[PDB]
Motif scaffolding. Sequence first.
Motif, PDB file in Angstrom:
ATOM      1  N   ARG A  86       0.900  -1.296  -0.161  1.00  0.00           N
ATOM      2  CA  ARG A  86      -0.181   0.131  -0.020  1.00  0.00           C
ATOM      3  C   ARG A  86       0.859   1.337   0.079  1.00  0.00           C
ATOM      4  N   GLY A  87       2.288   0.998   0.474  1.00  0.00           N
ATOM      5  CA  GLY A  87       3.008   2.509   0.247  1.00  0.00           C
ATOM      6  C   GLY A  87       3.881   2.671  -1.079  1.00  0.00           C
ATOM      7  N   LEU A  88       3.430   1.513  -1.851  1.00  0.00           N
ATOM      8  CA  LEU A  88       3.929   1.479  -3.249  1.00  0.00           C
ATOM      9  C   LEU A  88       3.091   2.128  -4.401  1.00  0.00           C
ATOM     10  N   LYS A  89       3.518   3.362  -4.699  1.00  0.00           N
ATOM     11  CA  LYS A  89       2.661   4.211  -5.737  1.00  0.00           C
ATOM     12  C   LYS A  89       3.359   3.872  -7.284  1.00  0.00           C
ATOM     13  N   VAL A  90       2.451   3.662  -8.045  1.00  0.00           N
ATOM     14  CA  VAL A  90       2.716   3.457  -9.603  1.00  0.00           C
ATOM     15  C   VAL A  90       2.605   4.758 -10.286  1.00  0.00           C
ATOM     16  N   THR A 369       5.693   6.295   3.569  1.00  0.00           N
ATOM     17  CA  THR A 369       4.732   5.232   3.688  1.00  0.00           C
ATOM     18  C   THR A 369       3.435   5.868   3.166  1.00  0.00           C
ATOM     19  N   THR A 370       3.349   7.184   2.455  1.00  0.00           N
ATOM     20  CA  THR A 370       2.067   7.425   1.847  1.00  0.00           C
ATOM     21  C   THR A 370       1.149   6.442   1.052  1.00  0.00           C
ATOM     22  N   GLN A 371      -0.015   6.478   1.352  1.00  0.00           N
ATOM     23  CA  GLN A 371      -0.628   5.203   0.877  1.00  0.00           C
ATOM     24  C   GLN A 371      -1.053   5.288  -0.743  1.00  0.00           C
ATOM     25  N   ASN A 372      -1.020   4.296  -1.369  1.00  0.00           N
ATOM     26  CA  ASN A 372      -1.415   4.206  -2.963  1.00  0.00           C
ATOM     27  C   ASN A 372      -2.828   4.503  -2.986  1.00  0.00           C
ATOM     28  N   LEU A 373      -3.565   4.711  -4.199  1.00  0.00           N
ATOM     29  CA  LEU A 373      -4.723   4.592  -4.432  1.00  0.00           C
ATOM     30  C   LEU A 373      -5.070   3.386  -5.011  1.00  0.00           C
TER      31      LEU A 373
END
Length: 389
Positions: A86-90, A369-373
């Motif tokens: 959830r901390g992985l943004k694409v 650790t900012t949450q992905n969407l």
Amino acid sequence: ANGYANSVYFTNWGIYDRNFQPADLVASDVTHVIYSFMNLQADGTVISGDTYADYEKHYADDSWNDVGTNAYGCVKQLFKVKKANRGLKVLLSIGGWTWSTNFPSAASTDANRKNFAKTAITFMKDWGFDGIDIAWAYPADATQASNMILLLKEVRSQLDAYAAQYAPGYHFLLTIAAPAGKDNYSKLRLADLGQVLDYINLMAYDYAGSFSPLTGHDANLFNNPSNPNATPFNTDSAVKDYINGGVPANKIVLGMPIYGRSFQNTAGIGQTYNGVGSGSWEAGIWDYKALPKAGATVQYDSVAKGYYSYNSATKELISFDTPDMINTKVAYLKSLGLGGSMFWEASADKKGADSLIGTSHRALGGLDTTQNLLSYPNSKYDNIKNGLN
Ligand SMILES: CC(=O)N[C@@H]1[C@@H](O)[C@H](O[C@@H]2O[C@H](CO)[C@@H](O[C@@H]3O[C@H](CO)[C@@H](O[C@@H]4O[C@H](CO)[C@@H](O)[C@H](O)[C@H]4NC(C)=O)[C@H](O)[C@H]3NC(C)=O)[C@H](O)[C@H]2NC(C)=O)[C@@H](CO)O[C@H]1O
Ligand SMILES: CC(=O)N[C@@H]1[C@@H](O)[C@H](O[C@@H]2O[C@H](CO)[C@@H](O)[C@H](O)[C@H]2NC(C)=O)[C@@H](CO)O[C@H]1O
Ligand SMILES: [Zn+2]
Ligand SMILES: [Zn+2]
Ligand SMILES: [Zn+2]
Ligand SMILES: [Zn+2]
Ligand SMILES: [Zn+2]
């Protein structure tokens, strides 16, 4: 962000010869996966450069008995990674070195810009991505540099409007790949970039190769004044110029190569040479996982802060980053309050202790650790819309 970026470029062509699939990423080490590359037309139209790699390829669990319009390829594989991390943004990356010729045209008019932003954002919301990386290599003059800012403001403005309707409260990321060469970066609207962007991925590598008269460090931190031919460029000057130009330090992500540049028929670093020779996939470029070669020994220029390998039996030198180099560049970027580490590219990394991305993660410590969407209610892909549930 609530900590350091540890970002890696994932190439869509990496799924072929390199046989590096999104599931092969060590996702636990990564804050941002930058999906490379989308192609671009002169009228601003962002397009898939490979629809099979992007959304058509069926992996072992991709069923052809699925009802509706569904996304596969790397898009579905990366959404699975997003679900498990959830901390992985694409991020969707547009252009790159071979696909930048149409940027000047694409950015040149309000109509082309509006088309670029709309088509880019369409892929982003359809594929289930967290933002857009613009890799225009590179704005060649004041017109292109100004237009690049107008393009980014069009994209930022359309991302925020898309969020306000279909992801209320979510902040879509807008980033660029930025040149480390003064010839290139002196033309940029640095202060404008610093205001409009989330991250500048400083491409602090490709200082020396076949295009160099003499062997050189590919990605050194500092000038070597007792061997200046070894350091035609240095990262430190570039980083200081970006910050003093008005890019906030914390938005600068330090780019690091996961490959080396080879020199043959050479005496050593700073010396004369003849040819780069062969490579891993392309002439004079070796994957970091193929380095150092059997026999070659790794020397360290402690002034330039750049490792290389030389074979005194075959007279081959290869400029590449080691885990120790990563630890030094991370100590360096933390000292200047930079935003984190970026890697080009995922497929070439080693696994375990010797992973450059792994080494970066441990050196940085507190990763973003900012949450992905995961909510894409406007995706034309039913599977994406339903979050693969
Ligand atoms: C952020 C940014 O600006 N990125 C810089 C990069 O541009 C640069 O990395 C280089 O990127 C170019 C693309 O811009 C890339 O070119 C690719 O070359 C490979 C060949 O190795 C092609 O791969 C083949 O694709 C076909 C189908 O498309 C496959 O069937 C075939 O198996 C592939 N062959 C192999 C051996 O895998 C790609 O098609 C091609 N991509 C494009 C869009 O043209 C270079 O490989 C990248 N070079 C390196 C060294 O990685 C990077 C480093 O210089 O700097 C970035 O930051
Ligand atoms: C520091 C600098 O400006 N060096 C230039 C190199 O960057 C450039 O190599 C290219 O740079 C891009 C990274 O910014 C890469 O995306 C691209 O793959 C790479 N080109 C090649 C040869 O791989 C060279 C162009 O030959 O010019 C230097 O001046
Ligand atoms: Zn092949
Ligand atoms: Zn199919
Ligand atoms: Zn916002
Ligand atoms: Zn922002
Ligand atoms: Zn951690």
